[PDB]
Amino acid sequence: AASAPVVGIIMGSQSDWETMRHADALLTELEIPHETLIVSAHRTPDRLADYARTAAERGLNVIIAGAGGAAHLPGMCAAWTRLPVLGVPVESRALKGMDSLLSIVQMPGGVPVGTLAIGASGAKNAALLAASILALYNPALAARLETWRALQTASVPNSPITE
Amino acid sequence: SAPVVGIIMGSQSDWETMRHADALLTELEIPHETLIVSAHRTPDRLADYARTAAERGLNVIIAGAGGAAHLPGMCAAWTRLPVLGVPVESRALKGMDSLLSIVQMPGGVPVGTLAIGASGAKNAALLAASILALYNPALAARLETWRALQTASVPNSPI
Amino acid sequence: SAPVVGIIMGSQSDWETMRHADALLTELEIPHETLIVSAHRTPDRLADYARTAAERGLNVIIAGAGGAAHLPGMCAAWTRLPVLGVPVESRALKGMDSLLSIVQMPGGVPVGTLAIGASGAKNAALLAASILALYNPALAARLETWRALQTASVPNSPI
Amino acid sequence: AASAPVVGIIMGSQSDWETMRHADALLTELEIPHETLIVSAHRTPDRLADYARTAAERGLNVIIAGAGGAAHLPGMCAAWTRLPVLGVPVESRALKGMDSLLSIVQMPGGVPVGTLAIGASGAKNAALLAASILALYNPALAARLETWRALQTASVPNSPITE
Amino acid sequence: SAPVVGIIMGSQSDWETMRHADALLTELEIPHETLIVSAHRTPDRLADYARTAAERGLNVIIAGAGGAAHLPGMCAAWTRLPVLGVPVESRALKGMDSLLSIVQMPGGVPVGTLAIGASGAKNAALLAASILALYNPALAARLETWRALQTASVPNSPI
Amino acid sequence: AASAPVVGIIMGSQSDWETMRHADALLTELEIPHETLIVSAHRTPDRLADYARTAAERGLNVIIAGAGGAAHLPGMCAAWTRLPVLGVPVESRALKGMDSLLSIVQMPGGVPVGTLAIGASGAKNAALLAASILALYNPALAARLETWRALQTASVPNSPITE
Amino acid sequence: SAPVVGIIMGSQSDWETMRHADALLTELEIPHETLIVSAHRTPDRLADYARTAAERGLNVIIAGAGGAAHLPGMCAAWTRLPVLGVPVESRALKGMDSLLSIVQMPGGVPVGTLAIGASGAKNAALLAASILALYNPALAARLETWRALQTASVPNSPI
Amino acid sequence: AASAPVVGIIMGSQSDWETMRHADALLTELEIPHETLIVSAHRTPDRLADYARTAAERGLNVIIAGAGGAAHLPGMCAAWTRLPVLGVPVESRALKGMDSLLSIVQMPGGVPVGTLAIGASGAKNAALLAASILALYNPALAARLETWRALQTASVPNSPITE
């Protein structure tokens, strides 16, 4: 039960891994049990439906979904689960993730997707946001998160390295 | 009499736009159904609709949605039938979000996308008609007449 | 009775948008506070609000702002609590400036961003509710009912 | 007659081939007889007029047209043929295909162009869309398309390769 | 009396914009014709118009269109005469689609593009006038007067 | 007098030459006498004022101006000359010429700038447009232009090289 | 009494926007002149104005323009004084053209750019005030009071 | 006192140095005493608050702030100081600085940030703008600035190097 996943990281394809691995790494650093899978809204719609519908009963508390282009994975996941869904816009080749961003963040009232920045920063922040959500009812994790945020602030240099 | 084209839209708010597709199909006497199906509010309704479309006799699906428009793409994910998407104009981004969320489908699952708004709805219907005309001589003739009237009716000078 | 969600907005001009978040939380019976906090006009008020949020018992912060929207990001800089941002539609750029200034946070300080405008405000409230529902069974049940009613209420055909 | 082309793939120039070859390959994979030509709306307007006007009588059922920049090939082809025309926005150097996309998709009511994604994905999907159209009256092709779509779904991995 | 400039537009809906070009040419006493020619609805009408323009005595063609604006570019494909394009403001994308579809012509077939809307129509007429003025002394003088009056009429302070 | 320049090609800086050289080459190919200079609207405003004001008296008939970023050269040239001014948006590093394009094409009613495409294509077309203007009163050039356009059309291949 | 700030705008149409800069300077009792100067219609008027600004005693120039907005940049080309630019909202592109044409000045000739519209005009005046306050103690005090009142006047909750 | 900084150059991170070094170099060239530091609005908000609040009392007259992405450093600095704040949008990876630009320039009425161009040009101009502000009450610097601007104008070539 201590190893049971509480966060699910899903992505449309292997090409999205270069970006989503940043979410995986952060969750591991904060000792947050999670699962990482590939789920395509367009190629495996039934797999997505089943995954999202059963997420809560399986013990998941937060879902982090990443996709690029006509990015529908986060939005459709949210349509099937009552759990909070965080979306990461994967940078696209031509439109640099603008298509990914608008397709994820512009959800109409009624079905939310908490959206993060385009790319690696967004993936890392999706993990951090998930951690902050979990920290609300996990004192141990809250402490680890506090230490992490504190270290981040303390590690900022006062002046740049002018070579 | 059975519908051969299905027009689906995310919500009642999309009707002002999608009614143009409905009117066109009726004008060309193409049997069709016009329904509301929300990818985000009624995902199971969408899955069932798209999955069973072919069996029910539908040949083409015209889907309209605005904002983070996922209806056309998800419909295409469940059916082998041609899916045409109409980006509905959104309040803030004027349909740019609708357009990109519909047209940028990665390789493997297509959605033939039309223009933002009423023009797109009308054209989705005309495109569906041109598809059906490939195997329906009578309709092909009516479509030819429609296109001919459109061309001949353009004035030579402004009023 | 103590607030568990704090809704903050840059100015009175943002209320027409943020009132949708307020209405939703009230509908779901989620105790909350609704205030005006300007990142640019009242920076110290913001620092104090964000810094003390956790101690005061708040669990989630919903922040709305338009233009060079910095309220959500700066709130997140001072609190460990989840911060959700709502881009308020701006006059000229229709919220594109609001959206980019809120969603593009670099790694290390997150802001869960929702859609531009009213939809975003409503969704920020719903997202906050889904977060609280993880440790509040009664609310979880009310949220399930809310989502179920939304799905069941969608019409099958346009009027 | 079994080799007679039923789909015509036309492109503005040789530079568009890198993109349009994806449509050609897909049609061949699905055993769909087709022709692939270069037709410039701006440099060979009369060639385009003749091609589009005679497409139907020549046996073509669908036209896939690709162009970049001020992309007019798809739209003008549609102005002269009653056949369904699918357009592929070729990525441009400066505007990354945004000019190509808007110049193709924003056709006013009356003359349609079913538009696909910018680049290679769009070319592949134009071919797939054409196949789905042809499948409506070709049982053999419909079967091949069904198998293709099914294989696509079955070939999606469950988890990413984390190196 | 024979027209030396041809103003063509996609449809009646473009007249509110293109009338500004017509008014300017008339003010400068430049003989011209004003017609409707649709690249998409009347492609053969366009081909004939552009192909025969030079023979008919036209020196410059001013073409206006909105959305997927192809009229200017296709006119230029058929004539050796200078073609000036006016992007008509579109409903959703405010002429950005019109602008890119007109100005981004690849090397080999030019279209001198003006601003979106009324300003562009007025300037297309003025640009045509500046072209004609190179070989028409009388017109050159009237154009000089027009430009001089424009400069001299600008107020020194706002009211 | 046969060597006297009838077209003036001006650019904001040496960095714009990579783009504007395409206009220079085209004019030379069509045997159109011209001058090519660097004139900065922002660094040499008085040089620009003098150049534009005296262009007509010096015999110039058309001015082709190229600039990038906050591109003001074409517009300000047009403010001082009654001659037709053609503008070429030079591609910029960050905004890919979108800033160049809007700063040149969006001239208000009263002071025109015939704008061409972003980059090399625009430079080549500025030269071609200038040639078409000059051809209206130069039978010899009109003939050369006709031959050039005809050759362009005849040189388009019928099919792509599929390697 | 002599003006230390010059507010210039392309045309009367820019006054609705630039009047906000005028009002602010008057409120802070900063002597200034408000004029119309068109970079495109009155280029020589602009050259003279910018060239002689310093000699006339001006310390800061606030320039507003829309569309292909060149007034601020060209003013900066002729004067060593700090030039602040205000992008006026345009009809079609909502000031995006104004903004890029003003802010994207290459290295060597700066223009401190403010937001599109009224906010930008007000801020250009405030920025000019903050500049003058560096060497004018009395004004510095009035500016401090202005900023303090702005901060203190923000309500704590929406109405 | 002659070495006391009158301009403060602050940036969000080391990654911004490649851009902001251009402001540093220009100020040094014009002999303007200044300090260059790293201050993160998001990672060190209290450091920013203290820096901005005490800037005036410490003798600073102008603050040049650079940041990228959701760039809040310039705006928040301006919220705490009465001094003029100039902002430099650092080019971002995906959106090429468009997110940086809008997040800095779109300040509402009441709290100004004089914004410069995206990237290196903006950094150099922020320094030049700061110099022009200081020159208003520093005759010696005004002379150096006049000479600098004059040299810039005189150094512009009349024609491009056509290789």
From TrEMBL, chains B, C, E, G:
UniProt keyword annotations, A-Z: Isomerase, Purine biosynthesis
Function: Catalyzes the conversion of N5-carboxyaminoimidazole ribonucleotide (N5-CAIR) to 4-carboxy-5-aminoimidazole ribonucleotide (CAIR).
Record protein name field: N5-carboxyaminoimidazole ribonucleotide mutase
One Gene Ontology molecular-function label: 5-(carboxyamino)imidazole ribonucleotide mutase activity
Pathway, per record: Purine metabolism; IMP biosynthesis via de novo pathway; 5-amino-1-(5-phospho-D-ribosyl)imidazole-4-carboxylate from 5-amino-1-(5-phospho-D-ribosyl)imidazole (N5-CAIR route): step 2/2
Coiled-coil segments: none
One protein family per Pfam: AIRC
Ranges where the PurE domain occurs: 3-154
Catalytic reaction list: 5-carboxyamino-1-(5-phospho-D-ribosyl)imidazole + H(+) = 5-amino-1-(5-phospho-D-ribosyl)imidazole-4-carboxylate
Family: Belongs to the AIR carboxylase family. Class I subfamily.
